[PDB]
Design a protein around this ligand. Structure first.
Ligand SMILES: CCCCCCCCCCCCCCCC(=O)O
Ligand SMILES: CCCCCCCCCCCCCCCC(=O)O
Lengths: 129, 129
């Protein structure tokens, strides 16, 4: 129903493989690969504010689903894309050659990003406040 | 007694002036000044693990009070210093020309970093799980 919350990374798969494929330096990959931080989502209807802890970087993006928005990626590149809400619990977008699916089930968010044959998956749990 | 917990930044003073003084790139100052992230402390006796969200960077440091430690600073430089316990609720250290005081008051942490005539203050609040 609502994505709002603070989410603690629990586990992830193919962080190093994904970050290498998009061109992150090995130095940043090694620094960030073991960080299990907290991301925050604030949802207000179709409007979302994301404060994402991804490795050693914090990225803060904002968008209304269905509207074109400029979003900062891991590389620092700002891409223009549209994020759609599928049902009430799935955010889906494409940018460059990446497909991204953010799915909320109960208190668990599963983020799946697909680049070629690499499936980068993050599983995070809502902090119960 | 224990610093352990996750803390969300509530307010801060003189971020830009302090970051300019230590030489952070202007582009990182502008993107980081408005981020209100979550920092995590894990304390085991005199041993501390810090996962700090500062602006758009995540910094992970470990140390034992009273022992010389190698710590990463906001610029990425590693410094060697000793962190002391003042009382039971203050961590105090000096490195280069900076004095840092981390004070725990119930659910509030206040971090004060003095560089010459600039006092960079951060106030954070424990996330109640
Ligand atoms: C699409 C713009 C953001 C690009 C950053 C990609 C790195 C992973 C993003 C996953 C965040 C999705 C929200 C769930 C919480 C989390 O996994 O931190
Ligand atoms: C000693 C240098 C550590 C890294 C420098 C980053 C600058 C901000 C450090 C403040 C962290 C103090 C921990 C309390 C929680 C917080 O304020 O995030």
């Amino acid at each position: 129903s609502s994505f709002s919350g603070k989410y603690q990374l629990q586990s992830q798969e193919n962080f190093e493989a994904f970050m290498k494929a998009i061109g992150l330096p090995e130095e940043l990959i090694q620094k960030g690969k073991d960080i299990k931080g907290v991301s925050e989502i604030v949802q207000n209807g179709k409007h979302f504010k994301f404060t994402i802890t991804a490795g050693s970087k914090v990225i803060q993006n904002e968008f209304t689903v269905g509207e074109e928005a400029e979003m900062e990626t891991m590389t620092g590149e700002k891409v223009k894309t549209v994020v759609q809400l599928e049902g009430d619990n799935k955010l889906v977008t494409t940018f460059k050659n990446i497909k991204s699916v953010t799915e909320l089930n109960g208190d668990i968010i599963t983020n799946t990003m697909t680049l070629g044959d690499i499936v980068f998956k993050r599983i995070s749990k809502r902090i119960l406040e």
